[PDB]
From a paper:
Herein, we described the [name] structure of [name] (dCH) from bacteriophage T4 ([name]) at 1.9-Å resolution using the Pohang Accelerator Laboratory (PAL) [name]. The dCH is the first identified viral enzyme from T-even phage, and it gives viral phage the opportunity to escape the restriction-modification system of host bacteria by the hydroxymethylation of a cytosine base. It belongs to the thymidylate synthase (TS) superfamily and catalyzes [name] to hydroxymethyl-[name] (hmdCMP) using 5,10-methylenetetrahydrofolate (5,10-mTHF) and water as a methyl and hydroxyl donor, respectively. However, questions about the cytosine modification catalysis remain to be answered because the methylene intermediate structure has not been elucidated yet.
Intriguingly, a bulky difference map was detected in the substrate binding site of the [name] structure even though no substrate-like compounds were added during the purification and crystallization steps. Therefore, by combining [name] crystallography and mass spectrometric analysis, the unknown substance bound to [name] [name] was revealed as a [name] molecule. For the recognition of the thymine base, the carbonyl oxygen at position 2 was recognized by the side-chain nitrogen atom of Asn170 and the main-chain nitrogen atom of Asp171, and the carbonyl oxygen at position 4 was recognized by the side-chain oxygen atom of Tyr96 and side-chain nitrogen atom of Asn179. Interestingly, the Asn residue of the mutant recognized the N3 atom and the carbonyl oxygen at position 4 in the thymine base, whereas the carboxylate of Asp179 of WT interacted with the N3 atom and primary amine group at position 4 of the cytosine base; this is shown in the binary complex structure. Our [name]-bound structure well mimicked the methylene intermediate that was the methylated pyrimidine nucleotide complex.
Author numbering:
A (entry chain A), B (entry chain A): 1 to 246
Amino acid sequence: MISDSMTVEEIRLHLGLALKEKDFVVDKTGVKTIEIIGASFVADEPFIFGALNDEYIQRELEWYKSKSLFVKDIPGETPKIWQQVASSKGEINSNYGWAIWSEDNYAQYDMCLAELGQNPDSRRGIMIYTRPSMQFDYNKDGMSDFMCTNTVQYLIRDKKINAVVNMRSNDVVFGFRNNYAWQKYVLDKLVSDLNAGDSTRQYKAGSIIWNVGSLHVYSRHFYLVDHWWKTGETHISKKDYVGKYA
Amino acid sequence: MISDSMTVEEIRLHLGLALKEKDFVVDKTGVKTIEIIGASFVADEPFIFGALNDEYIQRELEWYKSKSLFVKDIPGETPKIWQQVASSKGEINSNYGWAIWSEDNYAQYDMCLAELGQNPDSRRGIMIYTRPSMQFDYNKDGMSDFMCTNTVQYLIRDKKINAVVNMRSNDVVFGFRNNYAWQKYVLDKLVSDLNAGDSTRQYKAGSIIWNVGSLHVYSRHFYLVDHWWKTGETHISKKDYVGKYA
Ligand SMILES: Cc1cn([C@H]2C[C@H](O)[C@@H](COP(=O)(O)O)O2)c(=O)[nH]c1=O
Ligand SMILES: Cc1cn([C@H]2C[C@H](O)[C@@H](COP(=O)(O)O)O2)c(=O)[nH]c1=O
Ligand code: NA
Ligand code: NA
């Protein structure tokens, strides 16, 4: 039994209610947010609010395939957000290709693939992204990057592979869209690798379940929530939005 | 906004449905289980099925206060389960007092207390129990102890301190009852320590939210589920149970 969770549509609704309520909490940067504490839902759409950007996602995936911990190695011009959280030397913590494909984080992908190839029913098929020393590593050399993804667990049931994603913190607009594309790519690769190992397995991709301690919208994206609250459209250009949260 | 989750009562219901359905999955030990994948609920009662045992809980808490990684240091006679998962030398991984009070796991309690004493609104107040090297450490010296608790996050909102518990795996009957008593003790201590630091804070304990990749019942406890399914009583002695799952 997979848990019958909220869907992306219902998360949209609860965010709209928080905004209507004026239930604000002060970000570390001083900015207001709206927040769901302890959120859990099935990721049945590839975005919550906003639009897709295959070009950027493909650049972030090439960076993950390189496993580099330096933001300059992102193909093309590196985004400003990555520059602002990096150390004095351009270093970060959150390269998810490093987290799952590097020997330095204990070969999470290959060990999860070996565990499930040996025991398809296991509860120990997991890729652990964060680490206890994060209590001190988050601000090494002046960076500001406390890992947001804690763990991802994989469970094979009825010839489908399901993923359970646990995050400390996730931005609804950019974070969720990029992080979802990545989790789906990893899931499909794992399915294909298991199938090439044994042509009788015939596995397929299953569901992705999303769990978050603080799932939040920054006040700079309140307009998307408000517009969806009024119209049902999940995207509008900032230039075209008319409404209070300009 | 805390997420409006299932309660313990509703978890009881879904477990009863899995049992009725005969939706079984094979444990590593060969035994059948029933399972909810990706479960998330508020812990508003101190047990799901079964009875309380303050004596045993108090012994496990004294062991946690000692921080010892050896099962013999549990006060009095050490339980058989702890003996069966221990290494050739009596060693385990899962002492939660070690995980949060030892310098060797990077002082999780003291660093979370310092983070929240400095910024009550933070999203980085977390105690990280597991670690990436668990892909290799789970069977060190022949033990069988892949850490079950991944992380616990603390969020202070409206002068109440809420906890978000993330677990890979949890047994509904013994695991949940013992693990809940522990999480509530830590929460109350944190509240009291914050209040003694500043007599204007006046904080109080809030909600505990429980998230689990595989939340399961072993076939040896199917009787409790069945009895509750038939009668609404959350406990019965194994001697008194009449029914199929004898
Ligand atoms: C690196 C990363 C950051 N974030 C966002 C979540 C938070 O808004 C922010 C981290 O801020 P915090 O460490 O104060 O929670 O970055 C994601 O949503 N996904 C990611 O993968
Ligand atoms: C140490 C510990 C184990 N357990 C149970 C969960 C599983 O039934 C078992 C670990 O088995 P697994 O590693 O194969 O999932 O021990 C808890 O529920 N809580 C705990 O704190
Ligand atoms: Na670049
Ligand atoms: Na003992």
